[PDB]
Design a binder for these strands. Structure first.
Lengths: 217, 250
RNA sequence: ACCUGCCGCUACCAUCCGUUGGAUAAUGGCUGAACGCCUCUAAGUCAGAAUCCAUUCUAGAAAC
RNA sequence: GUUUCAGGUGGGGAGUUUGGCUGGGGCGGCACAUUUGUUAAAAGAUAACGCAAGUGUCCAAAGGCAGGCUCAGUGAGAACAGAAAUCUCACGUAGAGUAAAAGGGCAAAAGCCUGCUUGAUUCUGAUUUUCAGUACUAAUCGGAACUGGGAAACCAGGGCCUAUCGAUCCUUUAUGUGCUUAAAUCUUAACCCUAGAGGUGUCAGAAAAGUUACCACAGGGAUAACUGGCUUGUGGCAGCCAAGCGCUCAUAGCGACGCUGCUUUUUGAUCCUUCGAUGUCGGCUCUUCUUAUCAUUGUGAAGCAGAAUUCACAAAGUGUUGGAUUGUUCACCCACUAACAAGGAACGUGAGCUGGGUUUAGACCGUCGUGAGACAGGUUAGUUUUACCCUACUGUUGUCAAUUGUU
RNA sequence: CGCUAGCAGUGGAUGGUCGAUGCCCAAUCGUUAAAAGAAGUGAUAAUACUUUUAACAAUCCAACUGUUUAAUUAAAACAAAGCAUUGCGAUAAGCUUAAAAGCUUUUGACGCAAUGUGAUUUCUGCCCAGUGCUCUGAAUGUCAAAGUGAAGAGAUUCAACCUAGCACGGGUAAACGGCGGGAGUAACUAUGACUCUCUUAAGGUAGCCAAAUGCCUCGUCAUCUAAUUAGUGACGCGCAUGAAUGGAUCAAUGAGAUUCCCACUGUCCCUAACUACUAUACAGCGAAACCACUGCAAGGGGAACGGGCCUUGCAAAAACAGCGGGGAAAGAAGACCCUGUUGAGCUUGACUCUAGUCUGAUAUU
RNA sequence: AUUAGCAGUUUCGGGGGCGUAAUGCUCUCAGCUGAUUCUCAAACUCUGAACAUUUUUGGUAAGCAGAACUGGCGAUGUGGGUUGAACCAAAUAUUGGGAUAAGACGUCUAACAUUCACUAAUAGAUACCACAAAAGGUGUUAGUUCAUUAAGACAGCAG
């Protein structure tokens, strides 16, 4: 929250609140967008994925996240363009912060500023992340690695604390490694989904089956 | 005793106090001085920004928090945020000095602007200038008032400017159609009293007249008519900026 | 009471008197590596503050 | 008129009360008796003025019982039928409904529909829940009467379950016509006896309105007003990131959204310290220190040609002003200056001053109060005590009250 | 303190040493538990005792004179003349008194009693809904006792009749008091006469104003000053002015409140000198409050600001006269604030009563 | 609760391109459906865990406030942490000797040697504990991966 300094919340503590029929008075999240570059990009063309991870367990503010995304969206353009970056962020902010206001006071107090009826009102939407939990994620072509790591690097400045950058060993937004991705093409088990792969697999949820190979093929 | 072991003290606020008396009960709120104006100017900056506190007081100066019965009775509701909002919209608002000055400044401009709408016409391409009038106003000195409307103020002060001297404003043609019998009578009274032009008396084709006013003195020209004959067959009203056909007066 | 009033005290309501050496910081250079070049630096060294410490002045130790 | 009773009037006077919880006390709230989920950490027990909600009721049916049925929803159809009325059919483990909160429970039902009914009756014994193994509430379990429902099996102590509620006293009802009313006795009246009702929501239960700055007592640092302490949201200062400005050119100078610190010179939060009494605010006086350096000394950058300005290092050595107005730090102007930088020292500095505010009484207004009175509102007048003790400082003698030579 | 090119720093490695009221062993005393008795009491004759074993220039205000809070308020407070209202024609009004009785009354409206305002000058607008008062009101809804009628065997019950006051209806504002809120409204007018409407009866007239009354506020303008949160004069939807709660004015008056100017210059920057006197030295003469102990500091931690504790800096008899930083100096069981089921003084449309008073009734009759 | 595209639709929605225009196809975009994708939902949960430490609610926090389990402190000290109510060891009749605990072993202050590194800093020096972060360093140490190199590298100087 831009009112407060975020020192106030960069440690993952207090069991986690949410939007609900119970917490109605929340503001709207800062980021309401997780769409950076060419979303209509096939899975069989952008074989690289890089990831950014919070080194530290902590909260991660919505505003901060938003700020980060335009280190990967100004920097989308100067390097490569829209035909390299596909980002789903990979964290949202469900968690909320309260504010027991005593700003009331700037000269005296009414005493309601005190800890009677202490409980704060919703003010500041925010994410919670462990050390592994991933926070940015660019699926891309493998002629763009140093020109996307520097986006991630830039973003890292705009997160509290320590942030590790990495490249995985997969085609990005897939379980399956680059080694096991070529299998799919080869063995006739690649099934496209405009973004994802379903990957054709024999199984039985029927009575006597043979369309389980002949369905998607 | 006081003198020995703390002689005690009093403490002053620096927060705006938006106040409204409903059902003979003062409700007040906690806001800041340079936000409470900005709210009303269409700068929706979250309600939680303008409110320093979300609660209602009988008196926010001392700090007497307001009561549920009092609230519901006076507002038709006990929910406080809504009430606060209402107060912000409706009630008197304390302001700083700078803020106050801004309003005054605005008013100053306004009273010049209103004078500029219709100005002295040798042809119809000369003055219509706000600045000169404003300057004149400044240099003559008169109390600019927030209780007083702008138009009224202008009316008041133009007279003063006249004997500076400086000629101001231009007249327009508020046109009428009188009856055959009463029209003549009207003409008999209205010719030497005020300026009347395009007069053409007839037996069959009625009588047309054009009473001279700037729009801001249309009560005086009509009153006499009302007294004598009542309203005309048609009563033409035109705008208070241009006379519909280009001004040539004063 | 008032005027004048030495001696005496006293006034930017007057007069006179308020120094020079080293050591550096920042910093600017040298020679010169680590790192065949390079680079004020690492070894080393130069210049260098109203700074420091002496000289000056005060006082003078259960110190001589 | 007096008398004596009666009713009224009667703060003129009397006597009394003016709850409690409380991140001081008020103002506000009820966390004061209670119910739901979470708080609640896989028995249970568990707090906060913790969170999202409920209660003071309702229902001859919304009870009891049997049977019969299936509901939400969807799909495809059908004069009238409007997309959406009603009427079909499929699919529909419940997404519907079940008086009300939310949780549970639940489908040949606990839902809906019908019938018949008044187990929403009476006596009794045990128990559960919170527990103070006490009381109450609400509930459970059987036993005996009286019934009811269904062929029966069975079920029926009202509501599917968890909430929906109340001592002695007194009065009043119901009941066996019981028991007494103490010399016998009769009719009444009266008391008992047994179970109910009237109610106390501060909910294990006083008949209860203010103010006091004309006030007072006992205690409290359990608890407020100054400091100091922790804390630093707020204030103040500093870094990192670089979207952009700076013509052009990210970093000469700035610097977005964003991120990390330090500070205690803002104000809050807190209530550890003090109510066997640290004299509260400012101004004068006077020193000291800090540097987050305004000037000056020396340096380096600049969009530094010169001029002037801006940025930065070392450095706190020396400077850091005169006035109007304000109780005032703060504020804002005039004038000088090389510059008129920010701070600290018990918000430096009351046995150093002054008392201009704040601080009692008297008193004027305005708003508020039926009024006594109230005001972080305005106005005005209001006794500032003591060092002749120790230390600290300033100067002044004197001494190793001989270290083992005098002088 | 100091340390540094192995360090006495950091991170290790291999041994080793110091070291608790802990542990081991030993001793001594108690306690406990168990047992024993000629207690090293082998001539005693002890068991309530011993032993063993084990464990522990201007403005404001007030008219003026006057008065007042003796030891903090002398004023703008009080008073006052004037102005106004109220009650009362005597077995009055007001009052005191338990009672008896008495005063005002050596009084009689030209007065006495009780208010309120506060000289003059000029003005005192609207409101009777409230609350109080006032009634000679319509007369009746309620209405106690005694009294009366009925029932009952009576105790008793139940009924009618019904005064005062209450209720109802009028009077009353120089009585307490108020003098709106929402729509339009004298070109939008400044403002609100007005029209609708609601509240409660009305909705601020004359005037006055950032006033001893204006939060915002250092209002806006003009002036006064080189500069003015100050002053004065203007403006006025006035947070919250306003007409005997008296409105506006004002000569004189004022130990009252404020501004400016002039006389003022040690109440002038900047201090100086001088004398008295005390102090200071002596001579006599001699005192208290206070006093856990006590008086050197930095830092640390500690009821979080130490003189004592700890670690450092250090340290030199006995004293004098000044000074006021420290002794969280002293004086006072803070009365500011909270609490206690502590009080008081006062208030009211708290609860409860009551003097007295108004009417009813019996008796007196 | 909520992110993404994909496909199958379009007599149901809208606007274009294709015969004038559509929903006839094909598009981006509405709606619905199907398979996949993002974050799982203190008051959700098919599954299901064994003053101080641990857990934990409020609270930016607090030497704040409020709970749980154990321990202490407080009604016990001593040694050790310089000092210190709570941390460490460990509990006290009164003593002697021996050996320990925590903690130490240059000196204060009882207690030492040997050995390997690292640091060159106005440093760095034992929990609680008397604070330090994001972000920088061609400081030195230690590593890891890919590239180059006698087909002659690297830097240098020369063409």
């Amino acid at each position: 929250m831009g009112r407060r300094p975020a020192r106030c919340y960069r440690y993952c503590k207090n069991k986690p609140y949410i939007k609900s029929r119970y917490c109605r008075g929340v503001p709207d999240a800062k980021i309401r967008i997780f769409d950076l570059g060419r979303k209509k990009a096939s899975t069989d063309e952008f074989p690289l994925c890089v990831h950014l991870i919070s080194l530290e367990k902590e909260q991660l503010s919505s505003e901060a996240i938003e700020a980060g995304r335009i280190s990967c969206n100004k920097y989308i353009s100067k390097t490569g363009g829209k035909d390299s970056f596909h980002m789903r962020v990979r964290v949202h902010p469900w968690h909320v912060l309260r504010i027991n206001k005593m700003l009331s006071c700037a000269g005296a107090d009414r005493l309601q500023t005190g800890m009677r009826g202490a409980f704060g009102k919703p003010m500041g939407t925010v994410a919670r992340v462990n050390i592994g939990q991933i926070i940015f994620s660019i699926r891309t072509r493998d002629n763009m690695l140093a020109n996307v790591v520097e986006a991630l690097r830039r973003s890292s400045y705009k997160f509290p604390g320590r942030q590790k950058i990495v490249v995985s060993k997969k085609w990005g937004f897939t379980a399956y490694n680059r080694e096991a991705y070529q299998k799919l093409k080869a063995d006739g088990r690649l099934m496209n989904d405009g973004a994802n792969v379903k990957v054709i697999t024999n199984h039985g949820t029927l009575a006597q089956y043979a369309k389980d190979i002949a369905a998607a093929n | 005793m006081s003198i020995f072991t703390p002689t005690n003290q009093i403490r002053l606020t620096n927060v705006a106090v938006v106040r409204m008396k409903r059902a003979g009960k003062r409700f007040e709120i906690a806001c800041y001085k340079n936000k409470v104006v900005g709210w009303r100017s269409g700068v929706e900056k979250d309600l939680d920004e303008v409110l320093q506190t979300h609660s209602v007081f009988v008196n926010v100066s001392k700090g007497q928090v307001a009561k549920k019965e009092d609230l519901i009775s006076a507002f038709g509701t006990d929910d406080q945020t809504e009430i606060c909002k209402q107060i912000l919209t409706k009630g008197e608002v304390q302001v700083s000095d700078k803020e106050r000055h801004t309003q005054l400044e605005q008013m100053f401009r306004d009273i010049a602007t209103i004078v500029a709408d219709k100005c002295v016409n040798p042809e119809t391409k000369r003055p219509y200038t706000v600045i000169l009038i404003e300057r004149a106003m400044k240099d003559i000195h008169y109390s600019v008032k927030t209780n007083k409307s702008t138009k009224q103020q202008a009316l008041e002060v133009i007279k003063q400017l006249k004997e500076k001297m400086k000629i101001e404003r231009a007249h327009m043609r508020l046109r009428f159609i009188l009856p055959v019998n009463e029209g003549k009578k009207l003409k008999e009274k209205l010719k030497p009293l005020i300026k009347v032009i395009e007069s053409e008396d007839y037996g069959q084709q009625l009588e047309i007249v054009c009473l001279i006013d700037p729009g801001c003195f249309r009560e005086i020209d009509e009153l006499i008519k009302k007294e004598t004959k009542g309203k005309g067959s048609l009563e033409v009203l035109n705008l208070k900026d241009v006379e519909e056909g280009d001004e040539k007066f004063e």
